[PDB]
Amino acid sequence: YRPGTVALREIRRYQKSTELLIRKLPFQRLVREIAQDFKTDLRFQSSAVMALQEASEAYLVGLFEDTNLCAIHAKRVTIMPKDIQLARRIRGER
């Protein structure tokens, strides 16, 4: 395929599947690494980590959509740290 086409194929692949996009064990270890700053020796229901993962992936995906529009507005096809910060800026997360 001519360049850039494989990217649009990959986007299509990721937009038609429902699977989780972060690996389970890395995400679980991040959750526990954060948790022990708030209280030591916390236990987690198996389902609680999956709920966090679904919410986290949904948040990041939505953020990337807003990021994309920021890039395209600036007449770019590349997303950059600036685009994330503007999205976070206007969402009021700052």
């Binding site: 086409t5 299509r12 937009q15 919410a55 995906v61 994309n68």
Partner: peptide, 18 residues
Amino acid sequence: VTIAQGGVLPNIQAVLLP
């Protein structure tokens, strides 16, 4: 609202299309 195992709707911007 976020729906678990729901995925996104297919959407690709025009400027990104071939």
